[PDB]
Ligand binder design. Structure first.
Ligand code: NAG
Ligand code: NAG
Ligand code: CA
Ligand code: CA
Lengths: 161, 53, 107, 54
């Protein structure tokens, strides 16, 4: 894959969400993603709308995420009191999203859960994100390279044979 | 488009009650007129193909 | 009424602005709950900004269902609903093909 | 199939939900399900969380 920046800009919110799960130099997050939060704790999350166009000549993999917190309190803590909606939209896509906060068995200590979706953005098309919280945002879009073959194994690699 | 014979966009006015033994889809076919898609669309395509109209 | 299954088809209007959804069908949440003896589903509009295809950034998506004989399909809705005026029925046998060449009536 | 209890207990709501469709000793329900109704009519169903481990 070849990654390409999507050109998104945010003001009035945070952009440096992190957790003990994704540990880099201390707490961090997904490299090609950006956790978005209300500017301060329990603050208000503004209604935002961001767009990206596939300017290249092959389809573009667009991956976003929804954060179903463990507690409705954590959801108001991060994104703010009030209902939260995410409407992804392209020419082939037309989907809303809503965080369903609820306890889940502790996986990496966090009972919240992130749902990763994806779509193929046709060349010259645009993907539109409209959101006001609980939205893990894409930073770079992925593009395919060439031909390969996917194998799963459990033995050494050997370049001699 | 084959699915347009059910809903009835303007391109499909001639085929809202069509009857055929051989149905020929073309690339230029459009199932729709106001932006939107069909849900489970190939399943229904495959049905109307052998529907005789 | 007939003795062969019936093709019922409806549609949901996912608008561009939540204001457009209020302008048309009124504010508040909208819900369509198609029901039959075989089919229990439910549909909700998703108003949000989209690239404009043929102009209207709104989107009307279509769903379908096969209603058995003597059976009844029940729609329950309060907006953002594209309604079926006529059902579709199948006539018999045919061959579905996909081509880009002429049609020779003589061969 | 072998059935083993899941150890779920509730309060502040009802657990005796039944209907004329599942007929037994009168109106009943599913033997392995428990229809959770609010404690009384229109009483708020309290938010709950229950867990079972295999
Ligand atoms: C996208 O559309 C514009 C306007 O029609 C056109 O100039 C451009 O070449 C298109 N892009 C591609 C990759 O065809
Ligand atoms: C339903 O079945 C009954 C069988 O007694 C029949 O008389 C009736 O015509 C049927 N109706 C439809 C709509 O198929
Ligand atoms: Ca580069
Ligand atoms: Ca046992």
């Amino acid at each position: 894959i070849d990654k390409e920046a999507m050109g998104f800009t945010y003001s009035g919110i945070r952009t440096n969400g992190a957790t003990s799960a994704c540990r880099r130099s201390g707490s961090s997050f997904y490299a090609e993603m950006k956790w978005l939060l209300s500017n301060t704790d329990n603050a208000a999350f503004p209604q935002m709308t961001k767009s990206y166009k596939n300017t290249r000549k092959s389809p573009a993999l667009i991956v976003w995420g929804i954060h179903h917190s463990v507690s409705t309190a954590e959801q108001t803590k991060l994104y703010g009191s009030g209902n939260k909606l995410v409407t992804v939209g392209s020419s082939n896509y037309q989907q809303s999203f809503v965080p369903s906060p609820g306890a889940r068995p502790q996986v990496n200590g966090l009972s919240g859960r992130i749902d990763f979706h994806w779509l193929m953005l046709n060349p010259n098309d645009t993907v539109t994100f409209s959101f006001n919280g609980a939205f893990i945002a894409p930073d770079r879009a992925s593009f395919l390279r060439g031909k390969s073959m996917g194998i799963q194994s459990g033995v050494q690699v050997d370049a001699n044979c | 488009g084959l699915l347009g014979t059910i809903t009835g966009p303007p391109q499909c006015d001639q085929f809202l009650e069509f009857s055929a033994d051989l149905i020929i889809e073309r690339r230029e076919g459009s199932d729709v007129c106001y932006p939107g898609k069909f849900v489970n669309e190939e399943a229904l395509r495959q049905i109307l193909r052998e529907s005789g109209g």
